[PDB]
């Protein structure tokens, strides 16, 4: 029922979709730290279903206790931060499953957290999922892709360090 086991098709810095759905303007995330790019800059993603995964090979930084978000540091020296939805922390970890652990190295595509898009769909304030680079200061250029994306597959951003 899950092809989890099965082999898949396998195809400057490119950051990969850590989760799936339609790309959105950070500017439209209903939370100022995001919209004004206070925490950093990046994109947002309305979502597909099922899971969040590494967007670069690097090491997983923090994994919020309520497992709705996490950060990671790329081998390239970039910092990403993926935050599922807005105010999700109030669901108290209900919809989330920690597949990864606060400390391992990953490759793009490695599962990181798992989720219940539907429970989250009606419980959450919002489902947007910001994907931002926190260390803006340490990056020269940052390019924002558009439209549809698929986990571990489509790139959301390119950046020059």
């Amino acid at each position: 029922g899950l092809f989890d086991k099965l082999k898949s098709l396998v195809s400057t810095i490119e950051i990969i979709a850590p989760l799936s759905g339609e790309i959105v303007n950070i500017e439209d995330v209903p939370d100022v730290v995001f919209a004004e790019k206070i925490v950093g800059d990046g994109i947002a993603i309305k979502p597909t279903g099922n899971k969040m995964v590494a967007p670069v090979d690097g090491t997983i930084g923090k994994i919020f206790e309520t497992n709705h978000a996490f950060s990671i540091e790329s081998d390239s020296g970039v910092e990403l931060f993926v935050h599922f939805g807005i105010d999700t922390v109030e669901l108290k970890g209900e919809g989330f499953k920690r597949i990864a652990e606060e400390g391992q190295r990953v490759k793009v595509g490695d599962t990181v957290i798992e989720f219940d898009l539907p429970l989250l769909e009606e419980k959450a304030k919002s489902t947007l999922t910001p994907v931002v680079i926190s260390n803006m200061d340490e990056i020269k250029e940052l390019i924002k892709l558009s439209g549809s994306v698929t986990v571990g597959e489509t790139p959301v951003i390119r950046i020059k360090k």
Partner: protein, 489 residues
Amino acid sequence: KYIVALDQGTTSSRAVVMDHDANIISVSQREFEQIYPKPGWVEHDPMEIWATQSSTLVEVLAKADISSDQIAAIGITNQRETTIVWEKETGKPIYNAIVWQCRRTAEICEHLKRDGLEDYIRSNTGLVIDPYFSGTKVKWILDHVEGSRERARRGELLFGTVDTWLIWKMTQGRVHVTDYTNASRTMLFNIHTLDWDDKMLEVLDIPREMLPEVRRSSEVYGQTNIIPISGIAGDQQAALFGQLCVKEGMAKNTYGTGCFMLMNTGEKAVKSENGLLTTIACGPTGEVNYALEGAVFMAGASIQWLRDEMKLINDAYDSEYFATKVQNTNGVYVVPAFTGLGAPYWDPYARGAIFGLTRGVNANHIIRATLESIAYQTRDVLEAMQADSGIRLHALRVDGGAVANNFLMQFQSDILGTRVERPEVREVTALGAAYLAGLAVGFWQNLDELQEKAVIEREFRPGIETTERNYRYAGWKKAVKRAMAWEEH
């Protein structure tokens, strides 16, 4: 050549000495006793502030090696509202100093509210009916002494704030003055007409005879023998000034015994509709400006509580370390309304409470929550300022003793989702008075001479935890609402 500043605070009495280049040359600090004769009452011993403040001076001058010969002036900053009454002949107090924190005259405020003065008092004083300010403290004093009023109409009795008090003790009884900043705090002075309010004075049964002379925050008030004292300003305002507050929309947050957030409104007295005070500040020449103030009674003092009464820590500095051994407060919240709630709450009935305790909560959870109340309170105020002023801060400038706590500063940033800039010299309250005084003595001439000593030592920027900020704050809110109205009447 140099200016000497005197900062006489809630906690302690200091003495700083700067040079022409406004460089901190030497400091002397000396803590002093807080007296709690009862419940939410606070008191200091006039003779001890005095004693404490004096002594501090000497020892600074001595420290650095300087004489009456090289000191251009004396700048004076002090704790606000704290009321003192004293026999004019003697130079002896008729009662202990009553502190801004002290909640005794709560009933009196209840009359005032019962009567209808809110509207009036707000409008003319910019203040709010609360035991926080001077007015009611005085009444209570004359009311709790046999030969009081009477002795005072005949004027054998002087009123005064720590500036007035400290001054008179140095102008050997000669000079009886307060500045413009200080006086606003009283609930008896009118901020538009810039003079003692006739109605207040009545309503509260106070005698113009005891009121000192109200004057500019930069002026030579007199000369004293360690020479002239030329600056005066309430501590919060002096800090706004030494931050270079000075121009419209400019704001700072001071983290000391309490927290006071002020914003310059230039020449417009803005009416707060969100629990803030309208009060007086200084303009670039030490002139009267108006401002918005948000006062929070307990900040650093909570830490002193952990340190001195609970005994959970040796130094306040140790709080960063323990607080960070923890990651979270595990659900605990600390509402530090030890002496009621100030802005924007103003509930002198609230008392301190701890919350969300379970069996695995420990001392570190507790210390760190304490630290957090600091940020939260700040944030409550800030929001108010923003609403009242229509302006959105993009950075918060800060000073105070607590600002040396990277944990709290950062936490402050995350919690607000705003940058926090921590100035290079924390001792800004002092600085403020110095300028006011040097300026007045041609020691500096221009404020511009100084858009340079104000180096920014650090910026704190929102981390990823900032996303969590509204959940956390909601806790806080829940909490607060439950410490509310504890005491009765």
